[PDB]
Design a protein around this ligand. Sequence first.
Ligand SMILES: Nc1nc2c(ncn2[C@@H]2O[C@H](COP(=O)(O)OP(=O)(O)NP(=O)(O)O)[C@@H](O)[C@H]2O)c(=O)[nH]1
Ligand SMILES: [Cl-]
Ligand SMILES: [Mg+2]
Ligand SMILES: [Mg+2]
Length: 296
Amino acid sequence: NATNVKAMKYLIEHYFDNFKVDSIEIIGSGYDSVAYLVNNEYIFKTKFSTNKGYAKEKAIYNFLNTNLETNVKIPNIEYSYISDELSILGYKEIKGTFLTPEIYSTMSEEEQNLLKRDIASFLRQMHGLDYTDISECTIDNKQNVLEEYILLRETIYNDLTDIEKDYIESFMERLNATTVFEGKKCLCHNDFSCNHLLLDGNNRLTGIIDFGDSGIIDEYCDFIYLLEDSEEEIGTNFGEDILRMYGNIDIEKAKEYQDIVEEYYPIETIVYGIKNIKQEFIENGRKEIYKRTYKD
Ligand SMILES: Nc1nc2c(ncn2[C@@H]2O[C@H](COP(=O)(O)OP(=O)(O)NP(=O)(O)O)[C@@H](O)[C@H]2O)c(=O)[nH]1
Ligand SMILES: [Cl-]
Ligand SMILES: [Mg+2]
Ligand SMILES: [Mg+2]
C-alpha cells in the first residue's frame, strides 16, 4: 500500500524534472494500471508493460482538446512519459461528483432530462468530428472477435466442455448473421459508463474521463453502457431517452449491439486470460458461461 505510492512518487519526480509531490494517494485502479491523485490537484494514470499503451490515449486527448467545442471538461495532458516498460499521463483533476444510480434517483425529472441532453449533446459533438487527423485510431470490433476466436482455436478450445463450445459457437453464429457492424463509424469514447461521467453542483454534466479505449468504431459503441440494465448503470430507459435526444440512429440496433457485446463478455474474459497468461480469468469466463446457460 504505502510502498506503491513511494515508488510512484519517485517515478513522477524523476521523469518530470521540476515536479514536486507534496501528497499522493491511490484514487483508482484497473487490472493493468493504477491511478493517483497528486497534490490534491493532478491525476496521474500509470501502467507498466501490458499488451500496449498510453500513447493512443494521449494522442486522443491531444486531438480532442484541439478539435472539440464543448463546455464539458476532459483530461488535458500536461505530463507524459511513455516507454515500453512504463507509461505515465498527468493532467489536472476535473472536479465533480461521479454519476451513479443513487444520485440519479434523487434528481427531479427536469434535472434528469437536462443531464440526458447534456450527454446526447456531447456524444453528438464527438461523433460528428472530422477524425482524419486521428485516423490511425481505427478499431474493427468484428474482426477483433474473429481474431480472438482464432486464438481460442489455437490454444484452449479443444479442452473446453461441450456446453462452453456451444456457447461460443452460438455466439459466432450470431456474429455472422448480425448487421450491426455495417453502420456509421465515428470517433467514440468506447467506455462510456456512468463511472466516467462527472456532475457539477447542479447535477449537470461537467466532465468526462478515461478516453483510453477511444477510437473510430461503430457509432452504436457509445450507448452500450447507457443501455445496460445493471446495478452499476442507470437503466435501459436512460439510454433509450438519450438515443432519442441524440437522434438519427436506429435504437433497436443499438440495443442489438449492446446485447451482442453482453453475450461476448465471458469469451472476452477468457481471451484476456489467455493473452495475459492468467488462468483465473479463463476460469471466471468459463464459469460465467455456465451461469448464463442455466439462468432463467
Ligand atoms: N474526479 C476525478 N477523478 C478522476 C479524474 N481522472 C481520473 N479519475 C479517477 O481515477 C479513476 C481511474 O481513472 P481512469 O482514467 O478511469 O483509469 P482506468 O480504468 O482505471 N485505467 P485504464 O484507462 O488504463 O484501464 C477514475 O475512476 C476516477 O476515480 C479526474 O479528472 N477527476
Ligand atoms: Cl480454467
Ligand atoms: Mg476508467
Ligand atoms: Mg480506462
